[PDB]
Amino acid sequence: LKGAYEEAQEQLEAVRRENKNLADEVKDLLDQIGEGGRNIHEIEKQKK
Amino acid sequence: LKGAYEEAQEQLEAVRRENKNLADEVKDLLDQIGEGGRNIHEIEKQKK
């Protein structure tokens, strides 16, 4: 297990790394639908 | 040594749960921006 616990430990470092990576990637994609949500209104605004 | 592993195997399972809890939202926002991506391009075809 002394072999197992250390190789498990680095796997926590790998899983945490992608989690905080995508935690950065959820907010900017949320920002993408923000200005894009403004983008659908302004091309509607020129229409009517 | 098992007391860490009993914590870790609970921890690594719980964190990997939060991975796939956010990973589908990466797809769910990807469906969201794509649904606008059909929407923003089809109504602009109506404008022209």
Gap between the Cα atoms of B40 and B34, Å rounded: 9
Q: Which residues contact A22 (CB under 8 A, 6 or more apart)?
A: B19, B22, B23, B26
Which tokens is A39 given? 């983008």
Backbone angles phi, psi at B10, to 5 degrees: -75, -35
Gap between the Cα atoms of A2 and A7, Å rounded: 9
E strands, chain A, in order = none
Q: Which secondary-structure segment (H or E) carries A31? A: helix A2-45
CB proximity B1 to A under 8 Å:
yes
Query: Which three-class secondary structure state does DSSP give residue A1?
Result: coil
Using the structure block, give the residue that is written with the tokens 């860490």: B4
Answer for the pair A32, B31: CB distance below 8 angstroms, yes or no. Answer: no
Task: Enumerate the H helices of chain B as residue ranges.
Answer: 2-47
Which tokens is B3 given? 């007391």
| B14–chain A nearest CA distance, Å | 11
Residue of B nearest to A3 (CA): B1
Gap between the Cα atoms of A47 and A40, Å rounded: 11
Q: Reported resolution in A?
A: 4.2
